Amino acid sequence: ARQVTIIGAGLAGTLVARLLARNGWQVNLFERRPDPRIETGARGRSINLALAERGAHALRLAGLEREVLAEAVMMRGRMVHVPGTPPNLQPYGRDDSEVIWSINRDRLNRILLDGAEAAGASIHFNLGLDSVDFARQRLTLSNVSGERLEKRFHLLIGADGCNSAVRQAMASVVDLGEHLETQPHGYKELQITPEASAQFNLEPNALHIWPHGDYMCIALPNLDRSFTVTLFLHHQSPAAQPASPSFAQLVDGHAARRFFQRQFPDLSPMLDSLEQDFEHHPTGKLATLRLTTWHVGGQAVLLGDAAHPMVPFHGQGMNCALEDAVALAEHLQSAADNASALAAFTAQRQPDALAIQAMALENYVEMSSKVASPTYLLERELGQIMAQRQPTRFIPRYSMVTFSRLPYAQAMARGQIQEQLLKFAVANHSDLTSINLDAVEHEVTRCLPPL
Ligand SMILES: Cc1cc2nc3c(=O)[nH]c(=O)nc-3n(C[C@H](O)[C@H](O)[C@H](O)COP(=O)(O)OP(=O)(O)OC[C@H]3O[C@@H](n4cnc5c(N)ncnc54)[C@H](O)[C@@H]3O)c2cc1C
Ligand SMILES: O=C(Cc1nn[nH]n1)c1ccc(C2CCCCC2)cc1
Ligand SMILES: [Cl-]
Ligand SMILES: [Cl-]
């Protein structure tokens, strides 16, 4: 039996443990945190994630999809809150079967843990990886108090998150070629209670966005009708724009409140504990981390956030993580040896991780400044016409990322061609009446191969 050691019982680590264990691998999975299935007196505060086709299909192959969806809230469309008009629901894709699911992270983790153990994996909690010795094939683990334990390993999978100890240990034996790109936006999570969302008739079965240019709020629903609101806002004000809103200017809850009443006046009444949340929840940091290589020979490979931290603006990090786990399990299961498997995995997935990293950055502009401009409206309306006349050629980029399993690089490449097609068609035209539709359709057929 082939043996594998996995660091991190997060989303990618637990899924890959399930897929390998049920193929007969001996799987040991080590996790720094305690087991979240052991109930304690602490008050767990878990956020929700948007689960889409790529994540859903990976769970479907694992036999876990139905269990996960039982606990998920359907989001049928995007509820855009633009000042001056009523909130406007934009359906996802073309028909009612194209939805995103809002799923609690801790519930998903528990389901995945149960699934890995049922497939035969052994999960060891309260053991955090501290270092690796690649030449002696040993690693050092330790509990919180610092007491250390050594284990031999044969194949090591670093599924240990954006601050991966495995990636750090790989920097001893190979150049990963890391480039960290910081992001000027931080984020803060605020809460809407069920009473407040019910009192203000906030739609539960939708994803809600409050665009506002260089800042914005997003809200995902929970099963109990509460919402978690995420404010994205610059850490610091730029020197050129010294009065522009930023976190540094929101020192306490009362400034926060005046900000929301002025700039989000229909959302402010719903955030009852805006003051308290603002001061006791930490401001989070966003960053994109790109690696030229993900593995060391046949000994160790990264996946998930350990491999490609990305900004959350597409809701694709977990979706990408689950899709990585599927691909890593398939390559390991079928390769001549572990070395060939890890090379072929990195070669397949690294271009795709780059593509989704780039699309997540760009999607910030789409969500916060594009959805409210006159020019983008005309293009989106021409885009839906094109999807109807050429359905296998013109597939909107958001739809290819979110509702298909087209490799992310091909989605990006086709999206760039569509974007420039729509951009030139609508330029110097104010209405849809002055646009030659068959001209645009002819460029779809000349430039977009059918799927
Ligand atoms: C605010 C926010 C919102 C997001 N929303 C979405 C969304 O809506 N949709 C989406 O698809 N993605 C979303 N993401 C991204 C998503 O959360 C991650 O991409 C996903 O969790 C990656 O899964 P993973 O298994 O790689 O890592 P994680 O889920 O982070 O798992 C890492 C695991 O490794 C463990 N670990 C860490 N260090 C060690 C160590 N030294 N030793 C042992 N164990 C260790 C951790 O305890 C944890 O269990 C969001 C991210 C953020 C920050
Ligand atoms: O699906 C998307 C992107 C989209 N654009 N237009 N429709 N939705 C999407 C984008 C972001 C999120 C998360 C990001 C972290 C904070 C919670 C919300 C979820 C999902
Ligand atoms: Cl959309
Ligand atoms: Cl994400």
- With both helix axes pointing from N to C terminus, report the angle between 408-426 and 338-365 in degrees, rounded to the nearest 10: 30
E strand map for 22-178: 26-30, 48-51, 72-75, 77-80, 88-91, 100-104, 122-124, 128-133, 138-142, 148-152, 156-158
d(CA 400, CA 344): 24
Determine the residue type at 33: R
Q: Provide the resolution (angstroms).
A: 2.0
Q: Is residue 375 within 8 Å of residue 365, measured between CB atoms? A: no
Interval between CA 218 and ligand 2 midpoint (Å): 7
Which approach determined this entry? Answer: X-ray
User: At a CB cut-off of 8 Å and minimum separation 6, what does 186 contact?
Assistant: 232, 233, 234, 235, 247, 283, 284, 285, 286
Backbone angles phi, psi at 85, to 5 degrees: -135, 160
User: At a CB cut-off of 8 Å and minimum separation 6, what does 208 contact?
Assistant: 78, 79, 81, 87, 202, 218, 219, 220, 227
Interval between CA 92 and ligand 3 midpoint (Å): 6
Tell me 428's DSSP state. T
Q: What is the dihedral of CA 314, 319, 324, 327, to 10 degrees?
A: -120
d(CA 445, CA 393): 7
209-239 burial by CB neighbour count: b if 16+ within 10 A, else e? Answer: bbbbebbbbbbbbbeebbbbbbbbbbeeeee
Helix ranges (H only) for 253-396 are 253-263, 274-280, 317-334, 338-365, 374-389
- Any idea where the domains of the chain sit in the sequence? 1-369, 373-451
CA 184 vs CA 87, 255, 285, 397: distances in Å: 28, 21, 9, 25
Q: Using a 6 Å cutoff on CB, does residue 220 contact ligand 2?
A: yes
Which of ligand 1's atoms lies nearest the C-alpha of 14? 25
**Largest Cα–Cα distance of the chain, in whole Å?**
73
**Counting ligands in written order, which one lies closest to the CA of residue 402?**
2
- With both helix axes pointing from N to C terminus, report the angle between 437-447 and 374-389 in degrees, rounded to the nearest 10: 70
1-369: what fold? Answer: FAD/NAD(P)-binding domain (3.50.50)
